[PDB]
Design an enzyme around this catalytic site. Structure first.
Site, short mmCIF file in Angstrom:
data_model
loop_
_atom_site.label_atom_id
_atom_site.label_comp_id
_atom_site.label_asym_id
_atom_site.label_seq_id
_atom_site.Cartn_x
_atom_site.Cartn_y
_atom_site.Cartn_z
N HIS A 182 61.66 43.46 35.98
CA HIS A 182 61.38 44.47 36.99
C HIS A 182 62.25 44.33 38.24
CE1 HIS A 182 58.66 46.88 39.72
NE2 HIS A 182 58.57 47.59 38.61
N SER A 241 66.65 47.92 33.46
CA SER A 241 67.23 47.70 32.15
C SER A 241 68.74 47.84 32.13
CB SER A 241 66.64 48.66 31.11
OG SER A 241 65.24 48.68 31.16
N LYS A 290 58.43 58.68 23.86
CA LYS A 290 59.35 58.14 22.88
C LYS A 290 58.85 56.81 22.33
CE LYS A 290 64.14 57.11 22.42
NZ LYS A 290 65.56 57.28 22.82
N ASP A 291 58.00 56.11 23.07
CA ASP A 291 57.45 54.84 22.62
C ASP A 291 56.19 55.03 21.80
OD1 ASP A 291 59.47 53.25 23.66
OD2 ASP A 291 58.37 52.66 25.44
N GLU A 325 57.84 31.09 3.52
CA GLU A 325 57.92 32.52 3.80
C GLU A 325 59.35 32.92 4.10
OE1 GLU A 325 55.70 35.03 3.80
OE2 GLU A 325 54.05 33.76 3.13
C1 HEM Z 1 56.50 38.12 21.96
C2 HEM Z 1 57.76 38.25 22.36
C3 HEM Z 1 58.38 39.35 23.27
C4 HEM Z 1 57.86 40.45 23.86
C5 HEM Z 1 56.43 41.03 23.85
C6 HEM Z 1 58.92 41.11 24.57
C7 HEM Z 1 58.81 42.27 25.32
C8 HEM Z 1 59.83 42.95 25.95
C9 HEM Z 1 59.78 44.27 26.53
C10 HEM Z 1 58.55 45.21 26.54
C11 HEM Z 1 60.98 44.54 27.04
C12 HEM Z 1 61.40 45.85 27.75
C13 HEM Z 1 61.79 46.94 26.75
C14 HEM Z 1 62.95 46.67 25.84
O1 HEM Z 1 64.10 46.59 26.31
O2 HEM Z 1 62.74 46.58 24.63
C15 HEM Z 1 61.84 43.41 26.82
C16 HEM Z 1 63.15 43.27 27.21
C17 HEM Z 1 63.96 42.17 27.01
N1 HEM Z 1 63.64 41.05 26.27
FE1 HEM Z 1 61.83 40.71 25.31
N2 HEM Z 1 60.07 40.37 24.40
C18 HEM Z 1 59.77 39.29 23.60
C19 HEM Z 1 60.67 38.31 23.19
C20 HEM Z 1 61.97 38.16 23.61
C21 HEM Z 1 62.96 37.24 23.09
C22 HEM Z 1 62.65 36.27 21.93
C23 HEM Z 1 64.11 37.43 23.77
C24 HEM Z 1 65.50 36.72 23.69
C25 HEM Z 1 65.77 35.49 23.27
C26 HEM Z 1 63.87 38.45 24.75
C27 HEM Z 1 64.77 38.96 25.67
C28 HEM Z 1 64.71 40.18 26.30
C29 HEM Z 1 65.73 40.79 27.12
C30 HEM Z 1 67.10 40.13 27.43
C31 HEM Z 1 65.28 41.98 27.54
C32 HEM Z 1 66.01 43.01 28.44
C33 HEM Z 1 66.96 43.82 27.58
C34 HEM Z 1 67.64 44.99 28.22
O3 HEM Z 1 67.10 45.62 29.14
O4 HEM Z 1 68.75 45.32 27.76
N3 HEM Z 1 62.57 38.88 24.61
N4 HEM Z 1 61.10 42.46 26.16
C1 LIG Z 2 60.38 25.89 15.46
C2 LIG Z 2 59.92 25.68 14.01
C3 LIG Z 2 58.76 24.95 13.78
C4 LIG Z 2 58.33 24.74 12.48
C5 LIG Z 2 57.05 23.93 12.29
C6 LIG Z 2 59.06 25.26 11.38
N1 LIG Z 2 58.73 25.11 10.03
C7 LIG Z 2 59.56 25.68 9.16
S1 LIG Z 2 59.43 25.70 7.34
C8 LIG Z 2 57.74 25.26 6.76
C9 LIG Z 2 57.37 25.44 5.27
C10 LIG Z 2 57.93 24.62 4.27
C11 LIG Z 2 58.95 23.53 4.55
C12 LIG Z 2 57.57 24.79 2.95
C13 LIG Z 2 56.64 25.75 2.58
C14 LIG Z 2 56.07 26.54 3.55
C15 LIG Z 2 56.43 26.40 4.88
N2 LIG Z 2 55.76 27.29 5.81
N3 LIG Z 2 54.82 26.92 6.68
N4 LIG Z 2 54.41 27.97 7.36
N5 LIG Z 2 55.07 29.05 6.93
C16 LIG Z 2 54.90 30.41 7.42
C17 LIG Z 2 55.91 28.64 5.95
O1 LIG Z 2 56.62 29.35 5.36
S2 LIG Z 2 60.79 26.41 10.06
C18 LIG Z 2 60.22 25.98 11.62
C19 LIG Z 2 60.66 26.19 12.94
C1 LIG Z 3 53.56 53.69 24.97
C2 LIG Z 3 53.94 52.67 26.04
C3 LIG Z 3 53.07 52.42 27.10
C4 LIG Z 3 53.42 51.50 28.06
C5 LIG Z 3 52.45 51.24 29.21
C6 LIG Z 3 54.65 50.81 27.98
N1 LIG Z 3 55.11 49.85 28.89
C7 LIG Z 3 56.30 49.31 28.62
S1 LIG Z 3 57.15 48.07 29.63
C8 LIG Z 3 57.88 48.92 31.06
C9 LIG Z 3 58.88 48.10 31.88
C10 LIG Z 3 58.38 47.25 32.87
C11 LIG Z 3 56.88 47.10 33.12
C12 LIG Z 3 59.22 46.49 33.67
C13 LIG Z 3 60.58 46.57 33.49
C14 LIG Z 3 61.09 47.42 32.52
C15 LIG Z 3 60.28 48.18 31.71
N2 LIG Z 3 61.04 49.00 30.77
N3 LIG Z 3 62.16 49.67 31.15
N4 LIG Z 3 62.69 50.30 30.12
N5 LIG Z 3 61.94 50.04 29.04
C16 LIG Z 3 62.17 50.55 27.70
C17 LIG Z 3 60.93 49.23 29.44
O1 LIG Z 3 60.09 48.84 28.71
S2 LIG Z 3 56.86 50.03 27.19
C18 LIG Z 3 55.51 51.05 26.93
C19 LIG Z 3 55.15 51.98 25.96
#
Ligand code: HEM
Ligand SMILES: Cc1cc(C)c2nc(SCc3c(C)cccc3-n3nnn(C)c3=O)sc2c1
Ligand SMILES: Cc1cc(C)c2nc(SCc3c(C)cccc3-n3nnn(C)c3=O)sc2c1
Ligand SMILES: CCCCCCCCCCCCCCCCCC(=O)OC[C@H](COP(=O)([O-])OCC(O)COP(=O)([O-])OC[C@@H](COC(=O)CCCCCCCCCCCCCCCCC)OC(=O)CCCCCCCCCCCCCCCCC)OC(=O)CCCCCCCCCCCCCCCCC
Ligand SMILES: CCCCCCCCCCCCCCCCCC(=O)OC[C@H](COP(=O)([O-])OCC(O)COP(=O)([O-])OC[C@@H](COC(=O)CCCCCCCCCCCCCCCCC)OC(=O)CCCCCCCCCCCCCCCCC)OC(=O)CCCCCCCCCCCCCCCCC
Ligand SMILES: CCCCCCCC/C=C\CCCCCCCC(=O)OC[C@H](COP(=O)(O)OCCN)OC(=O)CCCCCCC/C=C\CCCCCCCC
Ligand SMILES: CCCCCCCC/C=C\CCCCCCCC(=O)OC[C@H](COP(=O)(O)OCCN)OC(=O)CCCCCCC/C=C\CCCCCCCC
Ligand code: HEM
Ligand code: HEM
Ligand code: HEM
Ligand SMILES: Cc1cc(C)c2nc(SCc3c(C)cccc3-n3nnn(C)c3=O)sc2c1
Ligand SMILES: Cc1cc(C)c2nc(SCc3c(C)cccc3-n3nnn(C)c3=O)sc2c1
Ligand code: FES
Lengths: 51, 147, 48, 49, 71, 378, 62, 378
Positions: free
Chosen positions: F200, F204, F226-227, F270
Site C-alpha cells: 500500500h 502496484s 474483474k476479481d 504429491e
Molecule cells: C498466501 C500467500 C500470498 C497471498 C495471500 C498473497 C497476496 C497478494 C495480493 C492480494 C497481492 C496484490 C494483488 C496482486 O498483484 O496479485 C499481492 C502482490 C504481491 N505479492 Fe503476494 N501473496 C502471497 C504470497 C506471495 C509470495 C510467495 C510472493 C513472492 C515470493 C509474493 C510477492 C508479491 C509481490 C512482489 C506482489 C506485488 C506485485 C506487483 O504489484 O506487481 N506474494 N500478493
Molecule cells: C520447506 C519444505 C519442507 C518440507 C517438510 C518438505 N517436504 C518435502 S517431500 C515429503 C514427502 C516424501 C519425501 C515422500 C512422500 C510424501 C511426502 N509428502 N509429505 N507431505 N506431502 C504433501 C508429501 O507429498 S518437500 C519440502 C519442503
Molecule cells: C473481489 C475482491 C474484493 C476485495 C476486497 C479485494 N481486495 C484486494 S487487495 C487490494 C490492494 C490493497 C489492499 C493494497 C495494495 C494493493 C492492492 N491491489 N492493487 N492492485 N491489485 C490487483 C490489488 O490487489 S483484491 C480483491 C478482490
C-alpha cells in the site's frame, strides 16, 4: 562493488565486533535456555536444572 | 518469566512417558515361540524378540570381514548369544518385510532389491548403514528390561 | 498409582498378582485369564 | 594544547561529561511538544554500545 | 497517495462516451481473430523452443528405460 | 457529510479497496493474489469441519478418515474439497511467484521478503497434513524427512525424537503433527496482512515496468468486477475435479493403511513436492542434500541484488525471455524425474537439471542483462 | 559528606545499558543454586516423618 | 529519520501505545481494561491445550476430563487454571462496567454500545463450556435453559431440537455445544479491537469528569509500568486459588456423572450467573421470565438517554452516590437468593429485589439528578 568498500566501513565494524560477539555469544548461550540443550547443559555442571 | 514458563513445557508431549511403567519396564515373557518374528505395539514399531537357536551363531560368525561395509557384529552389541533385540525400520527409507522369507535366513525387502539379515546386518544396496539396536540393560534373570 | 506413595514397585506387582483377571481373545484359545500386569485398574465388584 | 587532542581524547572526555548525566532544561513557548523529562533523561543512554 | 496528489501534467485532453450510448459487441470475431494472430506470432519463438527440448528428452528418457530390460 | 470519508471503520475500507489508485493496464496475471486469499479461506473452513471428527492415534487415524467419507453427512464432499483445494493453492502460488519474477516486482523489497517467508510456511503446513491420514505414504513420507533431519550436525538427533512424542510412532505421535498443522495457517493469515500493508506504500507494478501515476483509475468498480469474475472461474475448475475426478491427482497407495512390516512398490510424494525431491536424490550425502533443498527456496531472496539491467520488466528484453522459459521447462523436467525410479537414464538427467536451476539464476541471467545494456548503449 | 554504598555498579556495567538488558541472561545464574535452601528445605521441615522418602528406608532393605 | 515515526508498522504501535496522550490523574480503577485483555489471552491458550484431549460424547465426556487430571502431564494445573481463570474474567468485567457507570463513561456512545454486545457474548460462551464436562450440573443446567427456550412463541421448539443434534441427548449432542464454545472467544477478540479503535478518537475520561487536554502525559513510561504492576498482582491472586484452594468456587455435585435417573439435591449455577437466575424464578410465567432476563443486560443501552444531570461523573454528586451503592448492595442480595431453595422467606425477598433493580435505574436515578441541578441553580 565499491560503494561499501573504504576505510570507513570496517572502521565501525572494528568498533562493533565487541558489540557483535556480544550479538552472538548471548544468542549462543540463549539457545541452551530455550530448548533444554542437554549436551551443553553440563558444559559447566553448576546448572542442575533437570531436577 | 523464562526459567519455568518455557523450560518445563515439554514432557506432556515429550521424553517423559504418560504410561510410565509400560514396556521397557515390563516382564517380557515368551511372547513369541522359537523361530518367528511377530509384531508388538510398543516402543512404536515392533521390537522383535527372538528365541535364538544353537547354530544361528555360526550363521553370524562364518561371514568374514571384508565386503560387509558396516562393521557391527553380534559378539559386541547384544550381550548374550542366545538373545537378540531388533527395531522395525530400515536405514534409508523405513521398511521391514513379511516374516520368515529370505534366501540365506534373513528378511528380504521387496522394494527394489534389498535383504536384511536376522541380527541387524545388511548385504544389499542402497541401504547406507546397519540396523538400529535398541537401548537395554539385561539386569534380571528372566524379566526383561530392554531399556 | 501406588508406587512412591505407599508401596515400592515390588510389593506392588506382588499385590496385583493376588487376583487373576480376564483378558481378551486370541487364536488357539478363548478370552483367556491371567494374573495382574500392574497396568490394571482395581477389579470391579458386580457383574453389571 | 590543541595539538595534543586526538580522537581518543575527545571520545574519553565526552563520556565523562555527557553519558548518563542528568541535564538541566529551560523552555519558552509554544512548548506543548517539548518531550517529558523522563524521555529526555532516557535519551542520555544508548541502544547498542 | 490519493488522487489529486500523484503527478503533474499539462496540455492533454480526454474524450469519452457513456456506457449506455454504446454497443456491447462492435467487432468480436472480425478483429478478435486477426489480433490474436498478431499476438501469437510475436510470442512463439521465445516460448516454444524450450518446451520442444523437454519433449525430446522425455521421448529419449522413456526409451532407455524400456530397452534396459528384455534384450 | 460523506460517511465513507469520516467514519472510523469505513475510512479504512475506503482507502484500501474503494478509492485506491490502480494502474489501468493491469493484466489477468494480477488476478492470482486474490485467488490465493480465496484458497486460504476455503482451506480454513473445510479444515475446521474435518477436525471435529478426526482422531490423532496411530491405531484409529486411518479408520476415522474412512468414517467421515461413509457415515457423516456431506463428509465425502468436504474431504475431497480439502485434498483438491490444496492442489489449487499450490498452482496459484507458482503462477504468483513467476509473475513477480518476470515483471520485476521483487524491487518492492519489503513485500518480496515477506513473500519468501510465506512460501516456507505453506510448504511446511502441507507436509504435516499429509501425515495425518496415516496410510503407506504418510508413513514412508514421514520417515524419509526425519532420517534426513538427523543429519544436522549438533542438534539433529535431539529434534527427531521430539516430534514423535519422544518415540517411534504411537498414539501421542500424531498429536504434535496435528497441532503444528492446526496453528500454522493462522500465522500465514497474519503474515499476508503485513504483506499488503507494505504494498500500500507504493501501489502496484504494471506489465511495462514504467511508473503510471498519470494514468490511475479507482479500484472500484473496475477491479472489483474483474476479481469476482476470476474467482467464479476458479470455483468452476475446482468442482470439476471434486465431482468428476476426485482421485486424479492423488496416489492409490495411500488407501492401504500404514504397515512397517509390508512394502510399498515406490515412494512418490504429491506433485507439488516432486521438484524438491529430485534435487535431494542427486546429492550423494545427507548434509549436502538438506542444504541444497533449503537453498532452492532461499535463492529467491538474492533476486534484488542480482539485477543488472537498466529496465525493470522483461517485456522489452527478448534475450531474458528465452532464459525465463528455459527455467520453467527445467522445473517441469525436475517434476517428471522426481516421480521416476532411480535407474540409469533418470540419474544423470536428474543431476544435470539440478545444476541448470542454479546456473540460470546465479550466472546466466546477470550476464545476459549486461549484454542487453551494451546493445542499447545503456 | 560521606555517602552510602549505592554506586557499586552505576559506572562500570549498568551504565552502557549492555548489562541492563543482559542481566536477564548473564544475570540468570546461581539463584536456583540458592532457593533450594529455601522452599524445598522448608517443605520437608514442616512435614517431618510424613513423606515417602522419610519412611522408605524400611521396605528398601535389599 | 526517527524510525518510530516513519516505519509503516512502527507508526501504528507508536500512535497507540507509546506517544498516546493520557490524563495524568487516572486511578487504578482504570487498570481493569488491560486485565480483561490478559484474562482473555490466558483462557485461549489454556483452552487450546484442553481441546486436544477432550472427547465430545455423552458416554466418554466425563471420563476424558478425569483422564487429563490424572494421566496427562501438567493436566491438573492447566484444567484448574481454566476453571478459575473464568471466575477471574467475570470479576474484572463487573468492576469494569461499574467504573464506566459511576464516572459517566457511557457518553462515549460507540464505545459503550460495542461493550454491551461484548457482555452478551462472554456470558453465552461461559454457559457452553460448563456443559462440556457432563456431570449433574452440566445436565440439569442444560435442560433448565432449553425448556425455558421452548417458550419462544413461533420458532421456539424449532431451536431446541437443533442444539442437541436433533435427538434428545446422545454423542452428536455435545459436538454443537463444543463448536460454539470454540468459536465465540475469537469473535470477542475482534469486537475488542473495534472497541479500542472508537476510544482512540477521544482518549480517556478521568475521575473528575472534566476534559483534560491541558494536562496530558505520554502513555510510555507512566502507564506502561503501572499496568505491568497490576497484572503481576493479578497473577498472584489467581495462583493462590489454583495452588491452595482449587475447589473453593465450584460445586461438589459436578463430580458425579450425569444421570437422568438419579437426583441432585439442589440446582445451583456458578456464582456469576446467580443474579440472573434469581430474576427468572420471581416471574410465574415462562415467556415473562426469559424477557426479564434479557432486559436486565439490555437496560445498559438506555443509560446515555436517561442522563439528566449537568455534570458527567458522580464525584461531585453526593445523592447519586447513595443510589449507586444501593444498586451494588441489591446485586449482592440477588446473588445470595439465587443459591437458596424456593421457600417462604426467600420468595418475597427475591421478587422485591427484582423490582428494586429496575426502579433505581429507570426512575429513581433520573429524578435524583434533577433535584441536584435545582439545588445548584443548574
Ligand atoms: C498466501 C500467500 C500470498 C497471498 C495471500 C498473497 C497476496 C497478494 C495480493 C492480494 C497481492 C496484490 C494483488 C496482486 O498483484 O496479485 C499481492 C502482490 C504481491 N505479492 Fe503476494 N501473496 C502471497 C504470497 C506471495 C509470495 C510467495 C510472493 C513472492 C515470493 C509474493 C510477492 C508479491 C509481490 C512482489 C506482489 C506485488 C506485485 C506487483 O504489484 O506487481 N506474494 N500478493
Ligand atoms: C520447506 C519444505 C519442507 C518440507 C517438510 C518438505 N517436504 C518435502 S517431500 C515429503 C514427502 C516424501 C519425501 C515422500 C512422500 C510424501 C511426502 N509428502 N509429505 N507431505 N506431502 C504433501 C508429501 O507429498 S518437500 C519440502 C519442503
Ligand atoms: C473481489 C475482491 C474484493 C476485495 C476486497 C479485494 N481486495 C484486494 S487487495 C487490494 C490492494 C490493497 C489492499 C493494497 C495494495 C494493493 C492492492 N491491489 N492493487 N492492485 N491489485 C490487483 C490489488 O490487489 S483484491 C480483491 C478482490
Ligand atoms: C495482524 C498483524 C500481524 C502481526 C503478527 C505477527 C506477525 C510477524 C510480523 O509482524 O512481522 C513483521 C516483522 C517484525 O514484526 P514486529 O517486530 O512485531 O514489528 C516491527 C518492529 O517495528 C520491529 O522493528 P523494525 O522492523 O521497524 O526495525 C527497523 C530496522 C531498523 O531499526 C534499527 O536499526 C533500530 C532503530 C530503533 C528501532 C526501535 C524502535 C522502537 C522499538 O530493523 C533493524 O534493522 C534492527 C531492528 C532492531 C533490532 C531488532 C530486535 C528488536 C525489535 O517486521 C518485518 O518483517 C520487517 C520487514 C523488513 C525486512 C527488510 C527488507 C528491506 C531491506
Ligand atoms: C443514544 C444511544 C447511542 C446512539 C448510538 C449511535 C452510535 C452507536 C453505534 O454505532 O451503533 C451500532 C449499531 C447501531 O447503529 P446502526 O445500525 O449502524 O444505524 C444505522 C445507521 O443509519 C447507518 O449509518 P452508519 O454511520 O452506522 O454506517 C456506517 C456503518 C457501516 O460501516 C461498517 O459497518 C464497516 C463494515 C464492517 C463489516 C466489515 C466486513 C465484515 C467483517 O458503520 C457501522 O455500522 C459501525 C458500527 C458497527 C460496529 C461493529 C463493526 C463490526 C466489525 O449496532 C446495533 O444495532 C446495536 C448497538 C447500538 C444500539 C443502540 C441504539 C438504540 C437502540
Ligand atoms: C497477457 C499477455 C499475453 C500475451 C500474448 C498472448 C498470446 C497467446 C500466447 C501466449 C504467450 C505467453 O504466455 O507468453 C508471452 C507473454 C508476453 O507478455 P508481456 O508481458 O507482453 O511480454 C512482452 C514481451 N513481448 O508472456 C507472458 O505472458 C509472461 C507471463 C508472465 C509470467 C508467467 C506467470 C507464471 C508462469 C509460470 C509459473 C512457473 C514459475 C514457477 C516459479 C516458482 C518458484 C520456484
Ligand atoms: C455481582 C457481583 C459483584 C462483585 C463486585 C462487588 C464489589 C464490591 C464493592 C466494594 C468496594 C468499595 C469501593 C471503595 C471505594 C469507595 O467507596 O470510596 C468512594 C470513592 C470516591 O471516589 P471518587 O468518586 O473518585 O471521589 C468522589 C468524591 N466523593 O468512590 C469510588 O471509588 C467509586 C468507584 C467506582 C466504582 C468502580 C468499581 C465498581 C464497584 C463495584 C462493581 C459492582 C458492579 C456494579 C454494576 C456492574 C454490572 C455488571
Ligand atoms: C493453508 C492451509 C492448509 C493446507 C495446504 C492443508 C493441507 C492438507 C492436506 C494436503 C491434507 C491431507 C489430506 C489428504 O490428502 O487426504 C490435510 C489434512 C487435514 N487437514 Fe489440512 N490443510 C490446511 C489447513 C487446515 C486447517 C486450518 C485445519 C484445521 C483447523 C486442517 C485440518 C486438517 C485435518 C483434520 C486433516 C485430517 C486428514 C484428512 O482429512 O485427510 N487443515 N490438510
Ligand atoms: C472482553 C471485554 C472487554 C475488553 C477487553 C475491554 C477493554 C478495554 C480497554 C483496554 C479499555 C481502555 C482502558 C480502561 O479504561 O480500562 C477500555 C475502556 C472502556 N471500556 Fe472496555 N473492555 C471490555 C468490555 C467492556 C464492557 C462490557 C463495557 C461496558 C458495557 C465496556 C466499556 C468501556 C468504556 C466505556 C471504556 C472507556 C472508559 C473511560 O475511558 O473512562 N468495555 N476497555
Ligand atoms: C472467554 C473465553 C472462555 C471462557 C469464559 C471459558 C469458560 C469455560 C468454562 C467455565 C468451562 C467449564 C470448566 C469446568 O468447570 O470444569 C470450560 C470448559 C472447556 N473449555 Fe473453556 N472457556 C473459554 C475459552 C475456551 C476456548 C477458546 C477453548 C478451546 C479452544 C476452550 C475449551 C474448553 C474445553 C475443551 C473445555 C472442556 C474441558 C474442561 O471442562 O476442562 N475454552 N470453559
Ligand atoms: C502493559 C500494557 C501494555 C499495553 C500495550 C497496553 N495497551 C493498552 S490500551 C491503550 C489505549 C488505546 C490503544 C487506545 C485508546 C486508549 C488507550 N488507553 N488510554 N488510557 N488507558 C488506560 C488505555 O488503555 S493498556 C496496556 C498495558
Ligand atoms: C446471556 C445469558 C445466556 C445464558 C445461556 C445464561 N444462562 C444462565 S444460568 C445456567 C445454569 C443453570 C440454570 C443451572 C446450572 C448451571 C448453569 N450454568 N451453565 N453454565 N454456567 C457457567 C452455569 O452456571 S444466565 C445466562 C445469561
Ligand atoms: S527402501 Fe528400505 S531397503 Fe531399500
Amino acid at each position: 562493488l565499491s560503494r561499501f568498500l573504504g576505510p570507513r566501513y570496517r572502521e565501525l565494524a572494528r568498533n562493533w565486533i565487541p558489540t557483535a560477539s556480544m550479538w552472538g555469544a548471548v544468542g549462543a548461550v540463549g539457545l541452551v535456555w530455550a530448548t533444554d540443550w542437554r549436551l551443553i547443559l553440563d558444559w559447566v555442571p553448576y546448572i542442575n536444572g533437570k531436577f | 518469566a523464562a526459567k519455568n514458563a518455557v523450560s518445563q513445557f515439554v514432557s506432556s508431549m515429550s521424553a517423559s512417558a504418560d504410561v510410565l511403567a509400560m514396556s521397557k519396564i515390563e516382564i517380557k515373557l515368551s511372547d513369541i515361540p522359537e523361530g518367528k518374528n511377530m509384531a508388538f505395539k510398543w516402543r512404536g514399531k515392533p521390537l522383535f524378540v527372538r528365541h535364538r537357536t544353537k547354530k544361528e551363531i555360526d550363521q553370524e560368525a562364518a561371514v568374514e570381514v571384508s565386503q560387509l561395509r558396516d562393521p557391527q557384529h553380534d559378539l559386541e552389541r547384544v550381550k548374550k548369544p542366545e538373545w537378540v533385540i531388533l527395531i522395525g525400520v530400515c536405514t534409508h527409507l523405513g521398511c521391514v518385510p513379511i516374516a520368515n522369507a529370505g534366501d540365506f535366513g534373513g528378511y528380504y525387502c521387496p522394494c527394489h532389491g534389498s535383504h536384511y539379515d536376522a541380527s541387524g546386518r545388511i548385504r544389499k544396496g542402497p541401504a547406507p548403514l546397519n540396523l538400529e539396536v535398541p537401548t537395554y540393560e539385561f539386569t534380571s534373570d528372566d524379566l526383561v528390561i530392554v531399556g | 498409582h501406588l508406587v512412591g506413595v505407599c508401596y515400592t514397585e515390588e510389593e506392588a506387582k506382588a499385590l496385583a498378582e493376588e487376583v487373576e483377571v480376564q483378558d481378551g481373545p486370541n487364536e488357539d484359545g478363548e478370552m483367556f485369564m491371567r494374573p495382574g500386569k500392574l497396568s490394571d485398574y482395581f477389579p470391579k465388584p458386580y457383574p453389571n | 594544547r590543541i595539538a595534543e587532542v586526538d580522537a581518543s581524547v575527545v571520545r574519553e572526555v565526552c563520556s565523562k561529561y555527557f553519558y548518563d548525566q542528568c541535564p538541566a532544561v529551560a523552555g519558552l513557548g509554544p512548548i506543548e511538544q517539548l518531550p517529558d523529562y523522563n524521555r529526555i533523561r532516557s535519551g542520555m543512554f544508548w541502544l547498542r554500545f | 497517495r490519493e488522487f489529486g496528489h500523484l503527478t503533474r501534467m499539462r496540455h492533454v485532453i480526454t474524450y469519452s462516451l457513456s456506457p449506455f450510448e454504446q454497443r456491447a459487441f462492435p467487432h468480436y470475431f472480425t478483429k478478435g481473430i486477426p489480433n490474436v494472430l498478431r499476438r501469437t506470432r510475436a510470442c512463439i519463438l521465445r516460448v516454444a523452443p524450450p518446451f520442444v527440448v523437454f519433449y525430446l528428452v522425455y521421448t529419449w528418457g522413456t526409451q532407455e528405460f524400456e530397452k534396459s530390460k528384455r534384450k | 457529510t460523506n460517511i465513507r470519508k469520516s467514519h472510523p471503520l469505513m475510512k479504512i475500507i475506503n482507502n484500501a479497496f474503494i478509492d485506491l489508485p490502480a494502474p489501468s493496464n493491469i493484466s489477468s496475471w494480477w488476478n492470482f493474489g486474490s485467488l490465493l486469499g480465496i484458497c486460504l479461506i476455503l482451506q480454513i473452513l473445510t479444515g475446521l469441519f474435518l477436525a471435529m471428527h478426526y482422531t490423532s492415534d496411530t491405531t484409529t487415524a486411518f479408520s476415522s478418515v474412512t468414517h467421515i467419507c461413509r457415515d457423516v453427512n456431506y463428509g465425502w464432499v468436504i474431504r475431497y474439497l480439502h485434498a483438491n483445494g490444496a492442489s489449487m493453492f499450490f498452482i496459484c502460488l507458482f503462477i504468483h511467484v513467476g509473475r513477480g519474477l518476470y515483471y520485476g516486482s521483487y524491487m518492492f523489497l519489503e513485500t518480496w521478503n515477506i513473500g519468501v517467508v510465506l512460501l516456507f510456511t505453506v510448504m511446511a503446513t502441507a507436509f504435516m497434513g499429509y501425515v495425518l491420514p496415516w496410510g503407506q505414504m504418510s508413513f514412508w513420507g514421514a520417515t524419509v524427512i526425519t532420517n534426513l533431519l538427523s543429519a544436522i550436525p549438533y542438534i539433529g538427533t535431539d529434534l527427531v525424537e521430539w516430534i514423535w512424542g519422544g518415540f517411534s510412532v504411537d498414539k501421542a505421535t500424531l498429536t504434535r503433527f496435528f497441532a503444528f498443522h492446526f496453528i500454522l495457517p493462522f500465522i500465514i493469515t497474519a503474515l499476508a496482512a503485513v504483506h499488503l500493508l507494505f504494498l500500500h506504500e507504493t501501489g502496484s507494478n504494471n506489465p511495462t515496468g514504467i511508473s503510471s501515476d498519470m494514468d490511475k483509475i479507482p479500484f472500484h468498480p473496475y477491479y472489483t468486477i474483474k476479481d469476482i469474475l476470476g474467482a467464479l472461474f476458479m470455483m468452476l475448475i475446482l468442482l470439476i475435479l471434486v465431482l468428476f475426478s476426485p482421485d486424479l491427482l492423488g496416489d492409490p497407495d495411500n488407501y492401504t493403511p500404514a504397515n512397517p512390516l509390508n512394502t510399498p512398490p515406490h515412494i512418490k510424494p504429491e506433485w507439488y513436492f516432486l521438484f524438491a525431491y529430485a534435487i535431494l536424490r542427486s546429492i550423494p550425502n545427507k548434509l549436502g542434500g538438506v542444504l541444497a533443498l533449503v537453498a532452492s527456496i532461499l535463492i529467491l531472496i538474492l533476486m534484488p541484488m542480482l539485477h543488472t539491467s537498466k529496465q525493470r520488466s522483461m517485456m522489452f528484453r527478448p534475450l531474458s525471455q528465452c532464459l525465463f522459459w528455459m527455467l520453467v521447462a527445467d522445473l517441469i523436467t525436475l517434476t517428471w524425474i522426481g516421480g521416476q525410479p532411480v535407474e540409469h537414464p533418470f540419474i544423470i538427467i536428474g543431476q544435470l537439471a539440478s545444476i541448470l536451476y542454479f546456473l540460470i539464476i546465479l550466472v546466466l541471467m546477470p550476464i545476459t542483462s549486461i549484454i542487453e545494456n551494451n546493445l542499447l548503449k545503456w | 559528606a560521606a555517602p552510602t554504598l549505592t554506586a557499586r555498579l552505576y559506572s562500570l556495567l549498568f551504565r552502557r545499558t549492555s548489562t541492563f538488558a543482559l542481566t536477564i541472561a548473564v544475570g540468570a545464574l546461581f539463584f536456583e543454586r540458592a532457593f533450594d535452601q529455601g522452599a524445598d528445605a522448608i517443605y520437608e521441615h514442616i512435614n517431618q516423618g510424613k513423606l515417602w522418602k522419610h519412611i522408605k528406608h524400611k521396605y528398601e532393605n535389599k
